[PDB]
Structure formats: C-alpha cells, structure tokens
Amino acid sequence: MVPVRMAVIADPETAQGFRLAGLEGYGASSAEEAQSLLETLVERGGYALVAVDEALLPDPERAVERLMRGRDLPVLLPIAGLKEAFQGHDVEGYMRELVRKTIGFDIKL
Amino acid sequence: MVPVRMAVIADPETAQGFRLAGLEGYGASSAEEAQSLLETLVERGGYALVAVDEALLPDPERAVERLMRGRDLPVLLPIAGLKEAFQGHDVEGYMRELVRKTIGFDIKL
Amino acid sequence: MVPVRMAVIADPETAQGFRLAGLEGYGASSAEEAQSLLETLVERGGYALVAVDEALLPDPERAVERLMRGRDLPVLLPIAGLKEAFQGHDVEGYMRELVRKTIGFDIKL
Amino acid sequence: MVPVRMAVIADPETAQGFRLAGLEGYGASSAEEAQSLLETLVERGGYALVAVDEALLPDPERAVERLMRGRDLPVLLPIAGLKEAFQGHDVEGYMRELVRKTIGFDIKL
Amino acid sequence: MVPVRMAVIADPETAQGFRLAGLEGYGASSAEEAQSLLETLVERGGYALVAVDEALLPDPERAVERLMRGRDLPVLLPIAGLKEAFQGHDVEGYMRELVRKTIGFDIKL
Amino acid sequence: MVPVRMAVIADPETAQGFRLAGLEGYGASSAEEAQSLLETLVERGGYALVAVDEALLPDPERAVERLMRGRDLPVLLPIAGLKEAFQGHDVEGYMRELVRKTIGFDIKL
Ligand SMILES: [Ca+2]
Ligand SMILES: [Ca+2]
Ligand SMILES: [Ca+2]
Ligand SMILES: [Ca+2]
C-alpha cells in the first residue's frame, strides 16, 4: 500500500505557509503560470492529488487537456514492407534511405 | 550533437532480423501490442523516431493521441479557501477534511 | 514474509479512488486499453495479483495467452557439432557463416 | 544501432573454448540447465541470437513455447463492481476480503 | 541477527499460493526442471533453505551431487616461471604465446 | 565479439609487474590465498582464463574440485503435503512449524 502524495499550488505567500507546515506547496501568481506547474507534477508522477487555489485553476478541464499535450514524443513513421530490408545487405543503410525518403531527413544515426 | 536513436516495431520474426542487424527492433503481433511498446519507449525516453510496420500503426495520429493522453491523472482539485487553512493550527488535518468533504473519498495523508 | 504486491485495473475515476486510498490503481476505458495496460505492467515483474474490472476483461484466460505470446525472443539456433568451430583459427567468422547458412540473416558480430 | 550479441550454450569444455575465442559461451550438462540458461539470457535481455548444441535441445518448438510461458504468472482476477470499494472507508480491508472470497486465498497486503 | 531466507519449489498452482501468502514460491512440473531451479537459486546465492515438494525431488542426494557440477569455471593454467615474462618487453604478447603454447588457443586480449 | 578476460595469480611483486604492463595481476603469498582469489574470480564470473604460478597451486585438480564442490549450500528439504499449508489459514506459520518439524531447528523466518 502506497504513500499518497499531494501537491498544493497557491499564491507564493500561501505556499510558503504550506511549506512551513510540512506540505508540498508551490507558488504561482497567475493561472497560465500555474498550468505549467501542473504539467511538471503529472510529469514527475509522484502525486495522487494537486490542490490548486481556484483563482489559479478556473478551468480544470482545459488544464487537463493541456498537460497531456506537453508530452514530447518521438516522430512515428508508418512503413509499408519493412521485410524488404533483408532483401539486401546494408539494412541500416536501407532504413537511413527509407527514412530520408519519407520525412526528408538525414536523421543522424 | 546528440545521438539519434531510432527504434523499429515489426512482426516478431522481422523484429528479430532487425536486432540481428544491430537495429533496435521490437516485435508485436497486433496494433494494441504496438501501442503498449510505444508507451514503454516513450516512458524510457531517448528515441527521436519509431518506425512501425504500417499494418501495426495504420493511424500515427490516433496512436499519438493515446501517448499524450493515456495518463492516469491525479484528482485535480480547485479549492475555494486555502488561505483559511492557516486559521487553525493543524493544516494537515484541515486539508485532509477539505478533500474528504469535497470528493468524498478520504485521502491518505 | 515478503510483501505481496497487487495492482488494480479499472474505470479511470475508480482507479483515482484506489490511488487516494493508498492502493496501486490504474485507469482504463476499454478492454484494449486494459490489455495494453496489462502488457506494460506484466513485464514490470513486481505484481503478484492483478484485480481487473470484469467489464474490461471478458476473458481472463485468453488475456493470459496474449501476454505470454508478447515476449521478445532471441533467435534460437540449435547446432550440431558446435565444437568443430575450433578446427580452424577463426571461430567468430565460422559462426557468422554458420548463422548465415542456417538462417539467411548475416549477423553483425 | 546497438551491440549485436550472441550467446552459445554448449557442453562445459566447449563453452570454455568459446570464451577463449572471444564469444559468450555458457556451459550446460543437461537439457534442463540449457533451458534455464535460455530463460536467464532472455530475462537479462541483450541477446539477438542464442546458439545451442543440439544435443542439449530436445525440441526447439517446445523450448520457445516454455520461454513464451516463462513470463511467470501474476494471478488475474476479474471483478464485477470495483466501484463499491468506496461505500465504506476500508478500501484495503474490502480488497483483501473480496480477494479471499474469490480466489479462495488470503492475501498479504 | 538476520532472517533466514527460504524458497519453496512446488507445482505452479501451489507456488502461486505461497507467493500470495508472502513467501518465495517457484513453480516446476518435473524432477529435472526442479533441479534446474535449484541450480539457478544456488548460483544466485541468497537462500539458506529450499523446501521442495517431494514429487519434484525424488532423489535429493543426487540433487546436491549435481548442483556442485554446474558451476562454469575459467580455464585454470598453472605456469612455471611467470617472472621470465619481464625479461622481454611485450608481456601481453609473451602471455599470448604462452597460453597458445599450452592449450592451443589464440586468446583475444 | 567480446574482450577475453584473463587473470594472473602470482607472487606479490610479479603480480605488481603484470599490472604495470596492463594485465590483470593478483598477488598471493600462499596456496590458500591463491585459492581464495580463484573463488573470488569464479564468483565475479567474467574470466575465460586464470594463469597461476605453479608454486601456488599444489594440486590443480584439487583446486577445481574445491571450485565446483565447495561453496556453502542451502539445506535441501523434500516435503510431503505443501498443498496442505493453505488449507490451514496461516501458511507462514504452518511453514515455520513444518521445517522445524522436519530438520529440528526453529528457523528464523
Ligand atoms: Ca513538450
Ligand atoms: Ca489509463
Ligand atoms: Ca513483443
Ligand atoms: Ca554451467
């Protein structure tokens, strides 16, 4: 059974009070500015709950939408006939070309 | 100049061929296996690119939408009086009741 | 005693409840996402039991078998007369050639 | 692009010879010691190819089938109404008891 | 003072049940498979006792006998006059030629 | 194709000279210091080869026999009726009693 871990986002004064009382408080002074803090926490995904002063989280739904979309992803390339990289003998080569011809990259392998 | 790391998702025999060639090949026998491989690769972190047999990724956009999304989220909680939680002299107790009052679920702090 | 580690896979809001309560819940919205979850999980060897919402696991037998079949395997090459590789002065090259005769894939040793 | 690694499973003396020659040889004196080495190599994870002295491999289809079944089972327990672990505030109690009804087993959480 | 580490080897269903109870159960279905399991545990090192279903250990003296003949060893080469290697300036080359003079093998150092 | 690892066990100053020339020298001043070092190298696991000064190796077949046939074993306990440990209600303690029962030793589990 696991530690439940909770973050609190409030105004910087208030967050310092939270800190001094033994809780995990984070200062934010505007909303957008809170939202970025949230991605960072759902990032470092210790937390079961983030309590946010409501003036700093007026649209809970929209904030959710945005964190999810800050995930840096690799490029994904679908390919027809991967099998045919074994037809010859520079497989690495064949993929370097394959990719280069698809996305225009001399992807730096 | 950072290293470009590429992974390859193909049918299991094809994935074996890539690995024998010194490429990072991973085998999957279906769409949903491919997607779970994507999450593992994302979770791990250093891939600029995943190349996927397109019978296993017919829809890079859908797949991307699940990587950004998949996330289990924290209960995100906008709270109307965090500042009042310094009025008493047990902040930890006040906050525990504030969650319980609110979302019904008692939280384990 | 050694702990017993359990995971619970459920509807996304019930999963958050499990987290708040100190258990190790995971949200999933369909049967797919749920086996995609399983996959991701079952390679993280720690869990002894997995409790899954009946709705997201209409067949606990077949879900097993999918997961068994998901393991990436080295190519297994039985060889007669492995020892012959020491008749000459080139075991690496002997082996690379043996692999190629046998499996067609020219391994990069 | 990565190190291409092969292991060789042979009789102890032969395995010593391969290790002298720069290859990763493991010695086995029975089929089961080889099957155990296969599983260990696989669970370690870095091998594209495993060569095995045929005299050590009674049935290579079977040996794969065992590696596929060798992921080593987290008991799986489909459950009707997980939601209602929030009727009363002992989510854990409920779980250990439910599990005990279902699986006929106590569990140590 | 430090708790005695014990493993249990039993048929897979039972082995699963010992795990749910917090104990270290490992599943096997034959005398040979089980001896393999003894050897992996023995090599792996931390156990003071292994309790084995007798159906899986019908000959436990022969079992000991074997555990202690599965250890992979280096080739052990006694040499006269190892010093004399310091008289002519290519110690590594001297040693290469030595080993080859004694066992036939050109070693890759 | 991997680097071949060799060690050299010789008198302390000869071993220092092996190190100054880039080889893996280990000093021993007695037969029993030499046998310790072999055990330590065997136990690390890499070495294709261990060259030992003959003066430190009174009996090489004894040396090998001690390597195989000497490391400290797990007591090995065949048991009748392990299944019967669940059909109590306290497996952990039913097991404490059953091993004491047998060997005589209230072992520290
Ligand atoms: Ca981003
Ligand atoms: Ca989820
Ligand atoms: Ca796979
Ligand atoms: Ca061995």
Please provide a written account of the structure:
The structure is a homohexamer of 109-residue chains. With 109 residues, the first copy, chain A, is α/β, with parallel strands linked by helices. Chain A folds into two domains: 5-71, ATPase, V1 complex, subunit F (Rossmann fold), CATH 3.40.50; 72-104, Helix Hairpins (Helix non-globular). Chain A is 40% helix and 17% strand. The longest helix of chain A has 13 residues, at 31-43. Chains in contact: A-B, A-C, A-D, B-C, B-D, C-D, C-E, D-E, D-F, E-F. Residues 27-28 of chain D line the site of one calcium ion (CA). The PDB classes it as hydrolase. The entry lists the keywords V-ATPase, Subunit F, CheY, fret, hydrolase.
Tell me which CATH architecture of the largest domain in chain A applies here.
Answer: 3-Layer(aba) Sandwich
Shape of chain A: elongated
Strand/helix succession of chain A:
EHEHEHEH
Interface with most residues: E-F, 55 and 54 residues
Determine Rg of chain A (CA atoms, Å).
23 Å
State the distance separating the first and last CA atoms of chain A.
44 Å
CATH topology of the largest domain in chain A: Rossmann fold
> Which CATH top level class of the largest domain in chain A fits?
Alpha Beta
Give me the oligomer status. homohexamer
Bound molecules: calcium ion
State the total count of DSSP E strands of chain A.
4
Task: Write out the CATH superfamily name of the largest domain in chain A.
Answer: ATPase, V1 complex, subunit F
Q: Indicate the percent of residues in helices of chain A.
A: 40-55%
For the largest beta sheet of chain A, what order do the strands appear in spatially? 2-1-3
**Largest sheet of chain A, described in full?**
3 strands, parallel
Domains counted in the coordinates of chain A: how many?
2
Helical segment tally of chain A? 4
Task: Tell me the β content of chain A.
Answer: 15-25%
Content-based structural category of chain A = alpha/beta
